[PDB]
Design a protein around this ligand. Structure first.
Ligand SMILES: [Mg+2]
Ligand SMILES: [Mg+2]
Ligand SMILES: [Mg+2]
Ligand SMILES: [Mg+2]
Ligand SMILES: [Mg+2]
Ligand SMILES: [Mg+2]
Ligand SMILES: [Mg+2]
Ligand SMILES: [Mg+2]
Ligand SMILES: [Mg+2]
Ligand SMILES: [Mg+2]
Ligand SMILES: [Mg+2]
Ligand SMILES: [Mg+2]
Ligand SMILES: [Mg+2]
Ligand SMILES: [Mg+2]
Ligand SMILES: [Mg+2]
Ligand SMILES: [Mg+2]
Ligand SMILES: [Mg+2]
Ligand SMILES: [Mg+2]
Ligand SMILES: [Mg+2]
Ligand SMILES: [Mg+2]
Ligand SMILES: [Mg+2]
Ligand SMILES: [Mg+2]
Ligand SMILES: [Mg+2]
Ligand SMILES: [Mg+2]
Ligand SMILES: [Mg+2]
Lengths: 43, 101, 53, 155, 56, 49, 131
RNA sequence: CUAGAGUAGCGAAACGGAUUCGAUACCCGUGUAGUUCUAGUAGUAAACUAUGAAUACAAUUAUUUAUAAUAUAUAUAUAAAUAAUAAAUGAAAAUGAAAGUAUUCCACCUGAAGAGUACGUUAGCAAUAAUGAAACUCAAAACAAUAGACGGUUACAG
RNA sequence: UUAAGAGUUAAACCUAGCCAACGAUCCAUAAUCGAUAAUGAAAGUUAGAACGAUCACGUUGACUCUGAAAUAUAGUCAAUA
RNA sequence: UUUUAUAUAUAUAUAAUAAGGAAAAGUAUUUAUAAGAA
């Protein structure tokens, strides 16, 4: 999705909106650390 | 570009924007939101319609009744609901003719 | 050394190539679906032995 | 223009010289073709040929995007007096450190003076320079008064 | 998110068949086979139900 | 050994000549007062007073 | 999913060994069909002495009526069938194994497949099966 | 290590029996924690291939291993694993498709000992884990291989 | 207010920002440099005595007049002697 | 190779045929410079 942003920004925003995600969720560094699983209540 | 001191730490001012990628990234965002809403609504309408069709919902028995006929009233009702060939024409034939084309 | 390395594909050549590729895709899809229909027919031929009642 | 690919080609030619194969294949690109032509003009390579991944072209084949992936440039190596003519092939300007020299520094390098830790040109050696997407020997680039990127050494 | 919910719903609808089969297509194919053979109704319905259960 | 590792501070150790007479504070010599005169025994294989 | 069940039913009545296997087959088949299942085949293996004097609950068994059931069904009711089998005193031993249907929709049991008959269509032979 | 349950065998510690100049050890008996399960803390091993990852190339043989064919036979072709090698490299042992020819990135090292020690800081319920010196002493210290001696080192003969 | 910009200083009202593991903030140390000196094949490394350029200081700290320019080796006040 | 022939259904299988030969005498400055030993 970051490549899609670098290539076709309009389709990038369309796709992330359709999939239920935002720009921050794609661009920001992400690890499935215990902090994420606690904050978002994965379990 | 260089400028008089405008604050403690600010000594430069923008002069022009060669690439408007940052500007476009918000216009496209809003447009994507607006378009996704309407496309969602349309596809949800289609799904609800299909649910209604499946709610409304015997082809073998019906076709056999037409075949044996070749009684009159039920036959007419089934007609409203080579005719056997038309009612059983399969999408695979369309694929075959398209491939040949 | 100072001339183009390759000859660019014309739009007409690209159209013909795309038509060939689409035909290949649709052909493979067709054999897949027809094989699936054949398996369905073979299963129908033996559905009588299967107990559902 | 990948300097990585030129390094790979240099190592490939060195390996081929060690095992003494009479023919070898390298990627078919403008930079590689110009580099091979420059080596051939100096006499380091016996022959240039255009071909596929399997071998030289039996008949002339036009180069198009359809077959570009499978195109190769086949070079014939020379072994004279029980010694390889093309013995060592190295890079001066590496991808991590790229060296662009002005003309006067290029003359100084040819004249025995070490410039930016590059060993000076040796008598029977050839140094290749790239200027305006054209590959030439250092002497020509000096005669053309062109500032350029100093790529490789062939001794 | 509308898209994931729609896809999950369509998966969870009744009379959804696996292995790339479509219920209407299967019914039409079975009727075509019966017509071709013609050219016991509870037993034909039993074959249909067994096929649907297997492919459900 | 990599270029970026040399950039960050990697390189040959300095041939730094450590001072063998630190207490003089980089002076050719210093005046002093004798606290005691001591007679030591040298390390073997040397022997003397 | 196609599941092959191999049950080892106990023989208590020396005069009619098949009765208990009949009752068990009826129960399992009824469960499978009433929970949206299909019973493709029931292969009646014979009476065989068990390899050892196997023990279920307090009774000790030396022989058993072996039987096989090939049935297409879902995972949940398959686990339910297994649970009913394990607690039933009649079933000395039970085992359910998946028969994969990724390539061919119709497959025979392990016994017929080992004999050489890959499918049940081959089992019932092929005449006027090209319709 | 922290809570619960479990505890058949094994078994730190402990209690005794032997051996011994002495036994604080090896051997023997009873055996606590632990080994086990669940819910956690911690994040160290000779955590080793003592060999970071990716890419291009590099001469053979033999087996397998996995595919693709062609009619068991083509000692069939394409790949990877394994073994021995050529060149190459190396202080050598040796590596051998990497310890070779090249490119890119990261981590690490700068004599032995003091020392992974002290102090401080961070985290953990704690044991501890991470980070991590300096003074002083010395001309040492280590790796591979060579020839010897030696072994409560093997086998073969006389 | 200045001849002059600016949180430089003084006042007012808003925004939540700014720097930082490519090392902030804090601490220790240090006058800086050259077509100057030493050394090296050179890149560099060391010095900053002597020649030359810049800065700061004239026992310590703050402020004031004059002035174009001074917190002046001035004046006032205090500290030290 | 190329071209053509016969035969067979624009193409395929067989057979023949190949244009690349030119000669002549005479016409320095090179650079900067890295040594180890017990
Ligand atoms: Mg401002
Ligand atoms: Mg416990
Ligand atoms: Mg225990
Ligand atoms: Mg014990
Ligand atoms: Mg001992
Ligand atoms: Mg003991
Ligand atoms: Mg434990
Ligand atoms: Mg943990
Ligand atoms: Mg430890
Ligand atoms: Mg460690
Ligand atoms: Mg290690
Ligand atoms: Mg080594
Ligand atoms: Mg520690
Ligand atoms: Mg202002
Ligand atoms: Mg301020
Ligand atoms: Mg204010
Ligand atoms: Mg700092
Ligand atoms: Mg000072
Ligand atoms: Mg000073
Ligand atoms: Mg001076
Ligand atoms: Mg200094
Ligand atoms: Mg002086
Ligand atoms: Mg002053
Ligand atoms: Mg003063
Ligand atoms: Mg004084």
């Amino acid at each position: 999705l970051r490549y899609l942003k670098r290539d076709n920004p309009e389709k990038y925003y369309w796709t992330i909106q359709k999939l239920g995600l935002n720009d921050a969720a794609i661009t920001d560094e992400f690890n499935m650390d215990r902090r994420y699983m606690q904050d978002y209540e994965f379990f | 570009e260089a400028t008089r001191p405008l604050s403690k730490r600010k000594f430069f001012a923008i002069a022009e924007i060669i690439r408007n990628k940052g500007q476009q990234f918000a216009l496209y965002e809003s447009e994507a939101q607006l378009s996704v809403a309407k496309e969602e609504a349309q596809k949800a309408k289609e799904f609800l319609d299909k649910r209604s069709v499946r709610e409304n919902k015997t082809l073998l028995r019906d076709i056999r009744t037409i075949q044996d006929a070749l009684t009159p009233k039920e036959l007419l009702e089934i007609k409203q609901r080579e005719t056997v060939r038309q009612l059983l024409q399969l999408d695979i034939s369309g694929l075959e003719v398209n491939l040949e084309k | 050394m100072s001339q183009p390395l390759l000859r660019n594909r014309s739009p007409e050549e690209s159209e013909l190539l795309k038509l060939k590729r689409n035909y290949n895709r649709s052909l493979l899809n067709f054999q897949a679906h027809k094989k699936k229909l054949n398996e369905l027919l073979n299963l129908y031929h033996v559905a009588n032995e299967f107990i559902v009642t | 223009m990948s300097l990585v690919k030129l390094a790979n080609t240099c190592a490939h030619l060195q390996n081929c010289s060690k095992v003494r194969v009479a023919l070898t294949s390298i990627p078919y690109t403008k930079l590689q073709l110009q580099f091979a032509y420059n080596l051939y003009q100096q006499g380091f390579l016996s022959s240039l040929q255009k071909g596929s991944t399997m071998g030289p072209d039996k008949d002339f084949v036009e180069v198009t995007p359809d077959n570009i992936s499978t195109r190769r440039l086949w070079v014939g190596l020379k072994y004279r007096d029980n010694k390889p003519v093309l013995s060592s092939c190295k890079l001066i300007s590496k991808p991590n450190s790229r060296i662009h020299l002005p003309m006067e520094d290029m003359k100084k390098l040819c004249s025995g003076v070490t410039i930016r830790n590059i060993k000076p040109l040796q008598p029977g050696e050839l140094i290749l320079v790239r200027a305006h997407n054209n590959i030439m020997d250092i002497n020509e680039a000096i005669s053309k008064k062109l500032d350029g990127e100093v790529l490789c050494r062939v001794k | 998110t509308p898209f994931i919910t729609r896809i999950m719903a369509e998966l969870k609808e009744p009379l959804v068949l696996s292995k790339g089969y479509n219920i209407e297509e299967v019914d039409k194919f079975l009727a075509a086979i019966e017509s071709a053979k013609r050219e016991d109704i509870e037993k034909l319905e039993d074959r249909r139900e067994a096929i649907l259960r297997i492919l459900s | 050994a990599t270029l970026n590792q040399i950039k960050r501070g990697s390189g040959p150790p300095r041939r730094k000549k450590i001072s063998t007479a630190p207490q003089l504070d980089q002076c050719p010599q210093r005046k002093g007062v004798v606290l005691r005169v001591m007679v030591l025994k040298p390390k073997k294989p040397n022997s003397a007073q | 999913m196609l599941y092959e069940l191999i049950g080892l039913v106990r023989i208590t009545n020396s005069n009619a060994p098949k009765l208990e296997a009949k009752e068990l087959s009826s129960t399992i088949g009824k469960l499978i069909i009433q929970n949206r299942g299909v019973v493709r085949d029931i292969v009646p293996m014979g009476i065989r002495y068990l390899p050892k004097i196997m023990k279920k609950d307090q009774e000790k068994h030396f022989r058993a009526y072996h039987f096989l059931m090939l049935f297409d069904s879902s995972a949940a009711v398959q686990s339910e069938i297994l649970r009913t089998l394990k607690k039933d005193p009649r079933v000395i031993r039970s085992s359910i194994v998946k028969v994969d249907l990724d390539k061919q929709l119709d497959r025979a049991s392990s016994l017929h497949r080992s004999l050489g008959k890959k499918s049940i269509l081959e089992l019932v032979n092929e005449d006027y099966q090209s319709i």
